[PDB]
């Protein structure tokens, strides 16, 4: 069942691609565009539906469909389970950084100390979040969690996970939130709503609007993935359509790409590989698509490579 995929995501600095499947999970290096080098495979746990690495360390958090309320934290190179924790409901998302691990359930969020896996704080009776929409800053210094503060209005709760206290709620959109992403610094948050007309960027924790990008004329769209380049200069927005928009944070999309496959959610990231900025798109057809961004002039980006997410050649 290595070809029956359940999950794909990038690690915090876009150096690793993780893919979960019925047979287990795999990691791939993103140091080259010409090959997608497998660096690890584990089949000890089947039906892997969440797999989250900590940068390029050996720590991985895993969830299986066979036990969907159970989080396993492992040392993947030693092949050992370090600990596990079971929750009252299905785990919808797991996020981590070097200080904290967050588990999102439909009506609660658990904030763990990643140094000892103790629960430091639980956010209870949240607006129901069956999609598991949330974001966690990857930065060592600005350690914020963002999640929906209403299920009917696009309010963002911003929570400091070191001090264990809220920042200001951001009334980001009238309609409900569809996507959230922090930049690599943790000092900016990108948001989009179900309406999908604009992508907004707010300062964190002050909540001041810094940028507003017209995705385009208003239309039926579900924005699914927002991603910043590591230097914060570019922001990509993808959806269930074929167009990925790349915006440039300066003062019409700066660049666009047309995917060969659409109709479903995808995941994107902006990563510099071999000195060229790239857009990476993981799609529901089982491919990773790799495009080159021209950071000076933008425009239509060329497809350079596609690779099978299941590791096939």
């Amino acid at each position: 069942g290595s070809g029956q995929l359940l999950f794909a995501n990038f690690n915090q600095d876009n150096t690793s691609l993780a893919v979960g499947s019925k047979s287990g999970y795999k990691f791939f290096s993103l140091s080259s565009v010409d090959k997608l080098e497998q660096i690890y495979e584990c089949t000890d746990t089947e039906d892997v539906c969440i797999v989250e690495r900590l940068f390029s360390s050996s720590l991985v958090a895993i969830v299986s469909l066979k036990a969907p309320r159970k989080l396993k934290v492992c040392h993947f190179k030693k092949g050992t389970e370090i600990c596990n924790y079971s929750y009252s409901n299905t785990i919808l998302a797991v996020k981590l950084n070097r200080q904290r691990l967050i588990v999102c359930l439909e009506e609660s969020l658990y904030i763990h100390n990643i140094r000892d896996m103790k629960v430091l704080h639980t956010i209870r009776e949240t607006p129901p979040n069956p999609a598991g929409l949330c974001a966690l800053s990857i930065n060592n210094d600005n350690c914020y969690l963002a999640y929906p503060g209403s299920a009917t209005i696009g309010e963002v709760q911003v929570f400091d996970t070191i001090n264990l206290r809220a920042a200001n709620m951001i009334p980001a959109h009238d309609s409900p939130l569809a996507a959230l992403a922090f930049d690599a610094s943790g000092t900016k948050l990108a948001t989009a709503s179900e309406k999908g007309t604009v992508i907004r960027v707010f300062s964190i924790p002050e909540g001041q609007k810094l940028f507003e990008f017209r995705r385009g004329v208003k239309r039926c769209v579900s924005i699914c993935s927002l991603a910043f380049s590591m230097d914060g200069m570019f922001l990509s927005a993808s959806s269930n359509t074929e167009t990925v928009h790349i915006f440039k944070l300066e003062t019409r999309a700066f660049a666009t790409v047309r995917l060969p496959f659409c109709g479903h959610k995808n995941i994107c990231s902006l990563a510099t590989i071999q000195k060229i900025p790239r857009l990476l798109v993981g799609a529901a057809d089982g491919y990773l698509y790799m495009y080159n961004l021209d950071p000076q002039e933008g425009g239509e980006c060329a497809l350079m490579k596609q690779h099978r997410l299941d590791g096939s050649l």
Binding site: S57, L59, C74, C83, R98, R115
Partner: peptide, 23 residues
Amino acid sequence: NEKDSRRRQARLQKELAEAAKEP
């Protein structure tokens, strides 16, 4: 039983720190 819980927690702390080491 509590001294042993502290022993298991010390082991967990050590193992989490080791796994989080980055090259």
